Design a protein around this ligand. Structure first.
Ligand SMILES: *P(=O)(O)OCC(C)(C)[C@@H](O)C(=O)NCCC(=O)NCCSC(=O)CCCCC
Ligand SMILES: [Zn+2]
Ligand SMILES: [Zn+2]
Ligand SMILES: [Zn+2]
Ligand SMILES: [Zn+2]
Ligand SMILES: [Zn+2]
Ligand SMILES: [Zn+2]
Ligand SMILES: [Zn+2]
Length: 77
């Protein structure tokens, strides 16, 4: 499995969106329909899966699927 596949799987599960809709360019809010609680839960789900903590102000700027994948590749240890 790749990081892209694992991250997309988690986003879809958390937001209640079908896999085909979770495209790399998709905006969590504008395209995937995420609300305020979804942001919190999606961030914690990804921090748990990839055992990494992202500052909340930084997470707020991660607005697309690809930006989440990029952060994980850049910080997962
Ligand atoms: P509500 O009115 O309180 O908040 C609505 C907002 C639009 C402000 C909130 O949903 C928000 O700020 N959304 C921005 C996009 C988003 O959901 N970002 C988080 C994406 S996932 C992430 O950053 C995790 C990266 C990997 C960490 C290991
Ligand atoms: Zn693999
Ligand atoms: Zn949908
Ligand atoms: Zn968009
Ligand atoms: Zn909600
Ligand atoms: Zn934490
Ligand atoms: Zn946080
Ligand atoms: Zn690790």
């Amino acid at each position: 499995s790749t990081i892209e596949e694992r991250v997309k799987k988690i986003i879809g599960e958390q937001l209640g969106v079908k896999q085909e809709e979770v495209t790399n360019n998709a905006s969590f809010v504008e395209d995937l329909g995420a609300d305020s609680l979804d942001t919190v839960e999606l961030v914690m789900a990804l921090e748990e899966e990839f055992d990494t903590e992202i500052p909340d102000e930084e997470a707020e700027k991660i607005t697309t699927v690809q930006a989440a994948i990029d952060y994980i590749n850049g910080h997962q240890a």
